[PDB]
Each structure stands twice: as structure tokens, then as C-alpha cells.
């Protein structure tokens, strides 16, 4: 049994659209347990200055019970069947999903539909989750890594929809209303923009049947069933420096604008980041790690960790890197990093890519390690690519990447581009955008 075959033999992902526009998809395995959920095309990006944070406030009440079955009951009914209910919300994607035995696949589907369609929004609950969210913000404020990425966006997409935090403003959360929340749900949570995805020991048909049964609400006007295209977000080469010598370490993130979900280059871009990779003081590979940056990081104690990323979006993205270092090793670190980006554009080797690829292949495969992760991949590919891309395909696209190709793309997206940078902490040694800008050319 060869990798090649094990791929072809992976069951297909069934996709059928109901009448109201909702899409039901799923991957059936011989597993007794499963994961089903609805992945929505909503999020902070879809918010505005006045309702920024609603989608998150909503996330906080999605589980506090619906109208048909209030808090106590809703909770009790789920716990008692051993099901796990989780969910999240990003800038361009929200989702609620459940983990339970395939045997309850339908009762689950019912629950889901009841959550997205009939959230309680009990006036009394709101005022409580309001105090709660307010607390979550203070705790998250102490997580430099996310405070940084937020700032990164804040400036990389400054002045636009994407420049907003998923959680939202302090004011916004202090004043949002039963109304605004209701409105958000009734405006965004709609069939054509939703996907009921599932994976495990489920029958597509048993699923799609149970789907037609609880996801009814048919639309009348043409407006109701066309998916609204968002106004574009403008990238801006710029920097934001939140200094505080009182923090023990410094955080730095640098990025150029990304291509966006649909673009094929994204594959090569990922193949690229596979070369630079990532490090963190607990990798035992140490000085022998294959990643040049990681080595230098070790050889010269350049940092505590670092990661490359290719955060994609519908019409844009962020391709860059982030690293945590001590106040006095920020510069060398940055210097070396930008060096590697330059190496990508001008002197990548076949040897490098060959490996990067295998690392990437193993990566995609591991992204589907369980039911939740698979369901999460289905819920996403549809929402973003409009269909499902099977490992069999991914692999072919990845296998086709060669040095000469990695070079061209990276050059196309990195070389001589004005980057967006965010620094937090004791960042005095890292300095001058100008200097950083010139680290954007000549190997």
C-alpha cells in the first residue's frame, strides 16, 4: 500500500445544496464518533465601526440557550449525551460545531440549527457576558503574541475593515444592544453563506435529510440568496511600535501583502515558508536543524522562538513572520530573518524545496487528524474555495513546485516590497522602518 494509493482510496466529500442555498457536506469514515457543525462566512470583517464585536458577543450567547429550550435545559441536554460543543470566530469566518457519536448525528443537527436560528439573547444574559467579555479582553491583553498580530493587521490594513480586532472595541462591548446582536444574526447567519459539514460514521443522506428538516426558512427576495461581496482592504507598508521596556521580551512581526485563498501561488508560498520553517528553544534538533534561520537562531542565541505564516483571506492576506527575542538580540535576529527571505527570492535550492515539500505534505495530512479537523477542512474549503480539495490534489500541486518556481513567486510577493511591521515590548534595538525596508532587497 503506497502513499499514492492511500490517497486515491480516501473516500469522497459529498456536497449537496438545499433549496434555501445552504450547502451540506461530509466525509464518511468507519468511525462511531463524529463531528458536525455549521461554518459561517461572517466575522469582524463583516462588522463596522458601530457593531464591531457583535459577532463575538454573539459567540458568547450562542450556547447560553435558545428560545425553544433555555440555558439550563440546553446545557443539560447536551452534556447528558456526552457531546462536546465548541465554536469560534475570526475576521472572515465564524463556526459552531459538535463532537458526538454518529448515532446522534440527527439530534445534533437539530441542536445546531436551533442555535444559529433561534439564539435566546436573553436580555439578562447579555449584561452578564458583557462583564465576561470585558474580562477576556484584559486577559488577552497580556498575550503579546496576539496583541502583536492584532497590531500587525491594525496597520497592515489600517483604515479598513480588516484592521479591526475580532473581539472588538471596549466601548462597543459596553454599549452593544440586544438589538444590534439580534440584527447581526438576522443579517449574517444565512443559508447561502452557511455550510453544514460533518465527518465520521455518518450517512450523507441521513444528514442531508435531517438538514432539510431543520434548516427551513426559505428566502423570498433575490437579495436574500446572493452572497454579498465585501469592499476591498488596502495594504500599507508601515509600522506600529508599542514600546514597553518593562516587558521581559520583545515581539516582532513583519509581512507583505498576501494573494488570497483562491490564488494557486499560495501553494508555492506555503512551500516557501516550509523552508524557513519555525523554531523554539525546546526543539532538540538544535544546531542541526535543517532551517538556516533556526540554526543561526541557535548558533547565536538569536531568539526564543519564531514562526513563518501565510494567513490568507478572501481577497487578500498576510505573508510574513513573527519572533520573540530579548531586547539585545532583536537586531541580529531581524537581520538574519530578512536574509532568508532574500535567499528565497534569489538562491533557493532544489534540495531545499524537495524537503520543504515533504514537510508540507506531512503538514496537510496532519491537518486532517481526527473528525473535528476534517470537518473544519470541509467547512472551510467550501466557504473559501467553493469546493473540496483532496489530499490527492494538494499533493499534485505541491509535487509540481520546484526551486525556479519558489524563487519566482517569493520574488513576486516579497522582493522590494514595503512591508507592514508591528513591534511590542522592549524594542529599542530594533529600529528604523527605513533600514528594515532596505533589508527587502539584494540577497
Amino acid at each position: 500500500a503506497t502513499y499514492a494509493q492511500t490517497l486515491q482510496n480516501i473516500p469522497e466529500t459529498n456536497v449537496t445544496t438545499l433549496d434555501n442555498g445552504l450547502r451540506v457536506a461530509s466525509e464518511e469514515s468507519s468511525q462511531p464518533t463524529c463531528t458536525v457543525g455549521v461554518w459561517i462566512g461572517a466575522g469582524s470583517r463583516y462588522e463596522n465601526e458601530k457593531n464591531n464585536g457583535a459577532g463575538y458577543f454573539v459567540e458568547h450567547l450562542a450556547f447560553k440557550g435558545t428560545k425553544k429550550r433555555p440555558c439550563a435545559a440546553f446545557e443539560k441536554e447536551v452534556e447528558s449525551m456526552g457531546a462536546h460543543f465548541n465554536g469560534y470566530t475570526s475576521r472572515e469566518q465564524t463556526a459552531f460545531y459538535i463532537k458526538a457519536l454518529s448515532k446522534d448525528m440527527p439530534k445534533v443537527v437539530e441542536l445546531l440549527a436551533d442555535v444559529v436560528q433561534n439564539c435566546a439573547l436573553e436580555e439578562s444574559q447579555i449584561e452578564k457576558e458583557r462583564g465576561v467579555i470585558l474580562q477576556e479582553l484584559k486577559e488577552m491583553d497580556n498575550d503579546m503574541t496576539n496583541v502583536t498580530f492584532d497590531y500587525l493587521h491594525a496597520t497592515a490594513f489600517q483604515g479598513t475593515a480588516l484592521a479591526r480586532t475580532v473581539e472588538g472595541t471596549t466601548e462597543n462591548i459596553k454599549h452593544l444592544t440586544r438589538a444590534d446582536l439580534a440584527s447581526y444574526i438576522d443579517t449574517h447567519f444565512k443559508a447561502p453563506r452557511m455550510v453544514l459539514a460533518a465527518a465520521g460514521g455518518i450517512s450523507h443522506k441521513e444528514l442531508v435529510d435531517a438538514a432539510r428538516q431543520h434548516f427551513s426558512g426559505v428566502s423570498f427576495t433575490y437579495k436574500e440568496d446572493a452572497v454579498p461581496i465585501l469592499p476591498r482592504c488596502r495594504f500599507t507598508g508601515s509600522e506600529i511600535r508599542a514600546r514597553d521596556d518593562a516587558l521581559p521580551v520583545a515581539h516582532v512581526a513583519l509581512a507583505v501583502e498576501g494573494p488570497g485563498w483562491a490564488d494557486p501561488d499560495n501553494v508555492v508560498l506555503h512551500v516557501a515558508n516550509a523552508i524557513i520553517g519555525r523554531y523554539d528553544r525546546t526543539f532538540g534538533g538544535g544546531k542541526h536543524l535543517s532551517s538556516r534561520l533556526a540554526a543561526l537562531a541557535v548558533e547565536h542565541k538569536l531568539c526564543h522562538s519564531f514562526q513563518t505564516f501565510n494567513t490568507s483571506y478572501s481577497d487578500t492576506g498576510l505573508f510574513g513572520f513573527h519572533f520573540v527575542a530579548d531586547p539585545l538580540s532583536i537586531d541580529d535576529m531581524m537581520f538574519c530573518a530578512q536574509g532568508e527571505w532574500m535567499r528565497l527570492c534569489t538562491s533557493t535550492t532544489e534540495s531545499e524545496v524537495k524537503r520543504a515539500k515533504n514537510h508540507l505534505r506531512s503538514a496537510m495530512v496532519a491537518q486532517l487528524d481526527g473528525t473535528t479537523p476534517v470537518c473544519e477542512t470541509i467547512g472551510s474549503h467550501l466557504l473559501n474555495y467553493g469546493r473540496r480539495i483532496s489530499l490527492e490534489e494538494w499533493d499534485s500541486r505541491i509535487s509540481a513546485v520546484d526551486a525556479r518556481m519558489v524563487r519566482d513567486v517569493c520574488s513576486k510577493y516579497i522582493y522590494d516590497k514595503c512591508p507592514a511591521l508591528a513591534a511590542v515590548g522592549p524594542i529599542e534595538q530594533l529600529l528604523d522602518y527605513n533600514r528594515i525596508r532596505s533589508g527587502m532587497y539584494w540577497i
Binding site: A242, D432, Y433, N434
Partner: protein, 48 residues
Amino acid sequence: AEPEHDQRKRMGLKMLLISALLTSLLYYMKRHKWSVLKSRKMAYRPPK
């Protein structure tokens, strides 16, 4: 008294033209780099 008279003046001409051209250029370049600072904005955000 000074045979270079004409050549000296012909050079002065060239010197000015180049000079005016080169200066303008380097002014733009100087400004271009500095812009990063000139427009820079800051704020004081204590956890007050």
C-alpha cells in the same frame, strides 16, 4: 592675465546646470527618506 577666462566661464555654466540638477535630486531623496519621521505620529497609552 588669465587665458583660462573663457574655459573657466564655460565650466561655470556646466557647474551651475549640474549643480541645480544634482541639488534638486538630492533634496527629493533626502525628503523621501525622512518622510518616515516627518509624518510619524505617537501617543502615550499608560494602563492608567
